[PDB]
């Protein structure tokens, strides 16, 4: 709109819009220690 007053345009040959860009948010590395003992291992060796 601020560029409409100063210069003129043709028809838009294609339509676009504003989109948001981000990394593909996987962030997930499951393992042995996360699923086995998510608690303190001091508790586990006290149980031992």
């Amino acid at each position: 709109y601020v560029r409409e007053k100063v210069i003129d345009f043709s028809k838009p040959f294609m339509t676009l819009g504003i989109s948001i860009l981000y990394r593909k948010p996987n962030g997930t590395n499951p393992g042995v220690f996360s699923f086995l003992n998510p608690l303190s291992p001091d508790i586990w060796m006290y149980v031992l």
């Binding site: 608690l39 303190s40 001091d42 508790i43 006290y46």
Partner: peptide, 23 residues
């Protein structure tokens, strides 16, 4: 002794009493 580790002292006291009472 953690947030769930507070039962260990009661376990140790009960084990000492179970050793001392039985024979």
């Amino acid at each position: 002794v953690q947030n769930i580790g507070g039962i260990f002292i009661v376990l140790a006291a009960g084990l000492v009493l179970s050793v001392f009472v039985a024979v």
